[PDB]
């Protein structure tokens, strides 16, 4: 029983440099099997006789949608941790500045969401997949989602801070 | 009337010894001196143990089934508390100075560290009875050289890891069959060793020492034998290491320095995850949540307790009280909370349910004297050593005014007006009375005539005459509104100290200097009855005296004195350990009050131990100062005549127990005592004591449910009223529908109207049923409210309490609601287009 | 009659009172979430509003 | 401090000083202590202070 | 001493026996009636903002930086219990249907069967750090959905005149939170049908408002003259 | 907004704040330069006036006390 996962065209020199730190948990700690097709540009993992596959293939695929190292290997461990990807589609007008909206200058918008809400986000193109827990993810995605559909900066930077707060708040 | 117990223990939110929490950690449990408080911090509540130590108690611990507590003093007398039914369970003395004491984690075991002992007895269950001899020794293990410093629990109730002053760890399984798994040692520090832990796996242990460095000691191989794998140290240099914890669920050691500063740590990697400071004195105990959320740090110099969560970098609460320094206590108009003026210069307004300090005031530059309110609550005044009396609005948190004299006098009491126009305040050292307005803020008039320093002040509540009182050995009363200027001096036998005025202005209560209480009617200037309390007072015998406890004039009189609220009872207390309650029309002593049991405070013990009379001096006297572990304590610094000046260090002495204010509660049955200690808080509660009013044979719980069930709702309710039992007046009060609540409100007999009065407040302040309070409410106040009018002083204490009620839960659900409304119609009815 | 009559002046004048409080105090919250500022961190933000506080200055008696 | 103190505190106090003290406005929540409850949701400035 | 014993005769209403009287929830329906709590929840609700801005510390404490940034979810193996260790249970809006949170699930629900009994069980239920989370996060975007339902079930909530203070709390922190949006988009049926009929329950609350007043207003005057 | 300092001159001013506020768009009102330093100055001064007239419908019920008790006069 097996697993493959596309490495795309882009993410593919930092797997091969970086791969000798991704292979190790996925080899003696995972005690999985890990080929890496440089034919189909793909990851195979494999079990030997000697619930752990999706484990493995989140951490590469994780890899695969732009979270670094230690992001991929913080999925691979915490059980808690979850990663939910989504396109905008809610061409100029809204595709080419809603993006600009959520990166900011130099990304301080999507490093501000990232700290506040204690996720962390890549933004592709029009592609955002965020690394968090479960509430924390329903935050970071609503204030995401929040100004892409148009908020002012004053509110969401105001609801930041409390979600901030009240996220690490016990009571 | 006369049944109060020990309520609350109002200051002093920790003392000395570790704080507790709760297993589901809502309460956390604070050592007071030789109470035990307990604050729930989320039902906003608190109470204090009513049992007492005989010395400062040094170590708390309750097992996680919230079921029994055990405190231990400073030397060792434990005492075994029912925490569900607050009663004491067992009193045994360990023979040395205990260290810790911890349960553990599966109950059944208690162990502590009595000396250089690691004893293990086993806990006696909650439901057993009371036996001469409850607990079963386990064991008692003796390896450590030196004092045992600490008591780590495993995870599983299996082993338990010690840490000494001697330079070791040991651990030790609890049972023999395990004894080749834990018989290791743990050396290699250079200090005192603080602390050591497990961590979740029980794997690695770390062992925090004095020093600063904590050691990760792990089962492996250079056989397997419990190497050291790393040495972190905090490089904390001229600071070291106070009090440790670990939680070991989610690897935070948590770390409290002597300069106030604290660390929390991310353990095994040793990632600073926090530095921050209580303050500058020494950080006494750190205490942790059993979800590791909250952390509870005490300094003990100050009497301060934090408890701090550190996700969110937030404190929970950072309180902070005042041991042996609390000059005046007011009440607030409304029972709700205390002010507290305090030597070391500050006002401090403590809420009374839950035992917190809501406002601190910190503008006078010496002793607060004295504190009283006015305007209802909105203003308080306060009179201070350096010079100044000063106005505080308690809305905006403002020193608005502040009247000083020409002369450079430090003032001691003050009475306002109750039309709060002029303010008034008398000095030790000027013979003159200052009287100033407030409105403007200038200096009215100086009122001569005193030969003697004026002790006391009080204005008439009702036809607004002043009573001032000095150590002439004469109350005068002073007509200054309206053309008057008219003086009424009253001479008495002694030197008068505590005057205080009845709730009509009728007549005036002096203290005087030979023990007695002399009681005068005002506009007919002559002696209505005196009551002789110099008989039933407790002056104990210090320490230091060598004139017995019966010969010694100390103590017995009283420095303070205060009406109760219809006039007919007079609370007392001074510079001795009992404070005193009479009834002024038979002028005989209804209850007589220990305010400590502590031999840690001077003047307590009567008789004193002839053991400790040596050949030459006593054995307390002898001061072990140098006998001490670091610097900070074998330090005297403490100048040589000084008799209440401030700085507790600065005085030599034990601090002797007195009360310096006594007043009663405006709004419910009770009276709070400034002692040393803390505002002792003394209650009544009709729970307890069936205390009948003319009932006959055929008045019963039985017969009441039968009329209640029979639906005659007033004969019901004053048979409930006759039983004088509270859960049948909530019944019959619940039982009766809204359709008659007016009739039977008016058919109630007057004889029952304070009764019906003064339940609805004790159960509105905290009952959900707000309309079916309100409507009972209306229709009392409606069908019998002239008979208040013309009966004040009996409904004074029974509608100050209503009133509690409907400006404090109801109006503020009044609030709430009619801004929803206000809101709404803006929202719909307005025009937000773009 | 003059209990009725009464209280209805007063209430009409305290709605439009409790209308105009609740209006104006959306009126400059929106104005402050349009254009205040962006200071997520508790301790720049309280900072920031210290330094922008109203200041008054008193006389006080030591 | 150490004269008083030692004086037991009978002294004479400092003679006049009419200072200058800068109030900001800010919550009376938040000019309290840290406790889970508060005493009055004012403003530290007046109407006419403001 | 330690036990409470029956006063039940021996030979040879429990409640009424050990001498004790557990207050009944509420005494009639159309009787306002606070929650079964502490009173300080409101305010708590009501002021969380400032009262926490207050509790912080007047420095920022000294962090490490080589922290990792998930020390809040990296525990180990006494749990917790807050809004943020959650988890979801057993094709994109804010909060899929793999990823619904129980608060969204749950007013989702009662949406469909028009009882939000367990929608406002579960608020009365969790605290108020999770209740201002709960209700800052409520989808207030393309057809205010989310809104109108927790309207109508704040509505459903008053109707049955229990926790009546916690009702009236959560449509202030609605109103406080987003009320822009309805503001907004003031004069959209659904959202404008929700709050008349929030409106037709609430205007009877005046009840308390008179009762307070003459209470106030003769208690004063009983006292002082 | 000087009007309203009185507690005279006061009900002018929120009638005329009044017509203001809901005829008016509120975004308007809000970007307007200089709009929050009026109403700043002016939302403590409704607040103290609430606070008045509300305690003046507080002390109207003694003709509601004094009703009851002419009603109980037979």
Not at chain 1, 98 to 113: C, L, V
Not at chain 2, 295 to 324: C, N, R, T
Not at chain 2, 595 to 620: H, I
Request: hydrophobic residues 40%; neutral net charge.
């Amino acid at each position: 029983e097996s697993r493959k996962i596309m490495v795309p065209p882009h993410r593919m020199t930092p797997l091969r440099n970086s791969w000798t730190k991704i292979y190790p948990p996925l080899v003696e700690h995972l005690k999985l099997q890990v080929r890496m097709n440089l034919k189909t540009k793909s990851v195979e993992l494999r079990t030997n006789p000697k619930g752990a596959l999706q484990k493995g293939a989140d951490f590469i695929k994780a890899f695969t949608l732009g979270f670094d190292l230690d992001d991929s290997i913080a999925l691979l461990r915490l059980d808690d941790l979850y990663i939910e990807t989504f396109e905008v589609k809610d061409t100029g007008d809204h595709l080419s500045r809603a993006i600009g909206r959520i990166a900011g200058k130099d990304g301080k918008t999507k490093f501000a969401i990232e700290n506040a809400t204690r996720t962390r986000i890549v933004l592709a193109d029009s592609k955002i997949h965020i690394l968090g827990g479960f509430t924390h993810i329903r935050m970071a995605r609503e204030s995401v989602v929040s100004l892409i559909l148009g908020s002012p900066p004053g509110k969401v930077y105001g609801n930041l801070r409390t979600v901030a707060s009240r996220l690490k708040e016990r009571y | 009337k006369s049944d109060f117990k020990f309520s609350n223990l109002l200051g002093t939110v920790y003392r000395q010894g570790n704080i507790t929490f709760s297993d589901d950690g809502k309460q956390l449990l604070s050592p007071v001196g030789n109470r035990v408080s307990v604050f729930d911090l989320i039902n906003n509540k608190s109470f204090t143990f009513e049992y007492e130590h005989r010395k400062n108690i040094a170590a708390i611990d309750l097992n996680k089934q919230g079921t029994l507590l055990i405190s231990i003093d400073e030397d060792g007398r434990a005492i075994l508390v029912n925490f569900k039914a607050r009663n004491v369970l067992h009193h045994f003395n360990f023979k040395e100075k205990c260290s810790a004491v911890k349960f553990s984690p599966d109950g059944r075991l208690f162990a502590l560290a009595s000396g250089r002992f690691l004893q293990i007895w086993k806990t006696p269950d909650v439901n057993k009875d009371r036996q001469f001899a409850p607990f079963v020794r386990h064991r008692v293990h003796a390896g450590h050289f030196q004092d045992i410093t600490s008591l780590t629990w495993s995870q599983d109730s299996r082993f338990i890891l010690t840490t000494s002053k001697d330079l070791s760890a040991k651990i030790w399984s609890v049972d023999s069959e395990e004894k080749n798994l834990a018989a290791t040692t743990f050396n290699g520090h250079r200090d005192y060793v603080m602390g050591a832990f497990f961590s979740h796996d029980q794997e690695k242990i770390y062992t925090v020492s004095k020093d600063g460095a904590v050691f990760v000691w792990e089962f492996t191989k250079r056989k397997y034998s419990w190497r050291i794998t790393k040495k972190h140290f905090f490089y904390a240099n001229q600071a070291k290491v106070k009090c440790v914890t670990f939680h070991p669920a989610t690897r935070l050691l948590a770390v409290g320095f002597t300069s106030g500063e604290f660390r929390l740590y991310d353990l095994p990697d040793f990632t600073l995850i926090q530095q921050l400071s209580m303050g500058q004195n020494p950080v006494n105990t750190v205490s942790v949540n059993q979800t590791g959320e909250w952390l509870a740090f005490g300094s003990s110099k100050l009497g301060q307790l934090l408890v701090y969560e550190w996700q969110s970098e937030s404190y929970i609460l950072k309180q902070q009280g005042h041991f042996d320094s609390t000059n005046s206590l007011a009440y607030s108009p409304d029972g709700s909370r205390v002010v507290t003026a305090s030597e070391d210069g500050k006002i401090k307004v403590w809420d009374i349910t839950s035992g917190f300090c809501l406002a601190t005031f910190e503008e006078h530059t010496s002793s607060v004297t004295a504190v009283q309110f006015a305007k209802r609550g909105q203003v308080m005044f306060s009179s201070s050593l350096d010079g100044t009396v000063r106005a505080w609005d308690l809305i905006r948190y403002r020193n608005f005014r502040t009247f000083t004299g020409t002369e450079r006098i430090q003032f001691n009491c003050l009475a306002v007006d109750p039309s709060g126009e002029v303010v008034c305040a008398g000095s030790l050292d000027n013979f003159d009375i200052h009287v100033w307005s407030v409105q403007t803020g200038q200096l009215l008039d100086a009122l001569s005539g005193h030969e003697g320093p004026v002790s006391c002040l009080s204005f008439s509540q009702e036809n607004s005459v002043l009573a001032s009182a000095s150590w002439d050995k004469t109350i005068r009363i002073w007509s200054i509104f309206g053309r008057s200027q008219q003086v009424e001096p009253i001479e008495v036998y002694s030197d008068v100290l505590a005057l205080s005025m009845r709730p009509d202005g009728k007549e005036v209560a002096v203290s005087t200097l030979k023990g007695q209480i002399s009681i005068f009617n005002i506009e007919d200037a002559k002696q209505v009855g005196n009551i002789d309390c110099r008989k039933d007072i407790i002056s104990g015998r210090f320490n230091q005296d060598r004139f017995t406890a019966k010969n010694s004039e100390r103590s017995k009189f009283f420095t303070t004195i205060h009406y109760s609220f219809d006039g007919m009872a007079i609370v007392a207390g001074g510079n001795n350990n009992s404070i005193c309650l009479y009834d002024v029309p038979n002028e005989v002593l209804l209850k007589r009050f220990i305010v400590s049991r502590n031999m840690a405070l001077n003047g307590t013990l009567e008789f004193l131990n002839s053991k400790k009379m040596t050949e030459a001096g006593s054995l307390d006297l002898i001061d072990d100062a140098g006998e001490n572990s670091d610097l900070e304590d074998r330090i005297d610094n403490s100048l040589p005549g000084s008799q209440r000046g401030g700085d507790l260090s600065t005085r030599k002495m034990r601090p002797e127990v007195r009360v310096t204010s006594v007043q009663f509660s405006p709004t419910a049955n009770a009276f709070a005592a400034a002692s040393t200690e803390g505002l002792l808080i003394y209650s009544t509660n009709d729970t307890i004591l069936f205390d009948p009013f003319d009932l006959d044979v055929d008045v019963t719980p039985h017969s009441t449910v039968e009329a209640l069930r029979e639906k005659q709702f007033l004969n019901a309710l004053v048979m409930a009223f006759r039983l004088n039992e509270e859960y049948l007046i909530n019944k019959v009060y619940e039982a009766i529908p809204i359709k008659e609540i007016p009739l039977v409100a008016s058919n109630i007999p007057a004889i029952y109207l304070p009764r019906i009065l003064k339940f609805i407040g004790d159960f509105a302040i905290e009952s959900q049923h707000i309309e079916f309070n309100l409507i009972w409410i209306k229709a009392l106040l409606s069908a019998s409210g002239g008979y208040i009018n013309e009966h004040k002083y009996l409904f004074s204490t029974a509608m100050r309490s209503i009133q509690r009620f409907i400006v404090r839960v109801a109006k503020e659900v009044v609030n709430t609601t009619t801004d929803n409304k206000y809101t709404y119609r803006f929202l719909v009815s307005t025009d937000g287009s773009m | 009659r003059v209990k009725t009559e009464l209280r209805s002046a007063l209430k009409s004048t305290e709605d439009d009172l409790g209308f105009n409080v609740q209006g104006l105090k959306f009126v400059k919250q929106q104005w402050n979430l349009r254009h205040n500022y962006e200071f997520v961190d508790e301790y720049d933000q309280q900072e920031k509003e210290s330094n922008s506080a109203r200041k008054r200055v008193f006389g006080t008696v030591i | 401090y150490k004269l008083d103190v030692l004086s037991s505190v009978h002294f004479v106090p400092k003679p006049a000083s009419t200072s200058l003290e800068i109030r900001v406005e800010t919550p009376t929540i938040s000019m309290e202590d840290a406790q889970p409850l508060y005493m009055s949701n004012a403003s530290s400035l007046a109407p006419q202070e403001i | 001493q330690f036990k409470t014993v029956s006063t039940r005769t021996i030979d040879e209403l429990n409640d009424i026996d050990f001498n004790t009287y557990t207050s009944l929830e509420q005494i009639d329906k159309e009787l306002l009636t606070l929650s079964i709590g502490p009173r300080s929840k409101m305010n708590t609700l009501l002021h969380l903002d400032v009262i926490r801005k207050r509790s912080k510390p007047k420095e920022a404490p000294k962090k490490s930086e080589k922290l990792p940034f998930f020390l809040q979810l990296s525990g180990e193996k006494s749990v917790r219990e807050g809004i943020a260790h959650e988890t979801p249970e057993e094709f994109k809006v804010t909060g899929r249907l793999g990823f619904e949170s129980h608060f969204t699930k749950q007013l989702r629900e009662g949406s469909q069967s028009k009882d939000y009994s367990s929608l406002l069980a579960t608020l009365i239920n969790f605290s108020p750090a999770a209740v201002d989370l709960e209700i800052r996060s409520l989808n207030s975007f393309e057809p205010f959905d989310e809104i109108v339902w927790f309207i109508d079930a704040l509505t459903q909530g008053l109707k049955s005149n229990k926790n009546f203070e916690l009702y009236e709390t959560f449509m202030s922190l609605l109103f406080k939170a987003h009320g822009d949006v309805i503001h907004a988009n003031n004069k959209n049926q659904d959202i404008a049908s929700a709050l008349q009929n929030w409106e037709d329950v609430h205007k009877k609350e005046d009840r308390l408002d008179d009762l307070v007043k003459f209470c106030m207003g003769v208690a004063a005057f009983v006292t002082t003259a | 907004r000087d009007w309203n300092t009185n507690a005279k001159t006061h009900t002018i001013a929120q009638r005329t704040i009044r017509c203001i506020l809901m005829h008016h768009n509120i975004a308007k009102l809000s970007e307007i330069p200089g709009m929050v330093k009026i109403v700043d100055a002016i939302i403590p001064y409704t607040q103290r006036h609430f606070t008045r007239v509300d305690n003046l419908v507080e002390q109207s019920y003694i003709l509601d006390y004094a009703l009851v008790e002419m009603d109980k006069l037979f």
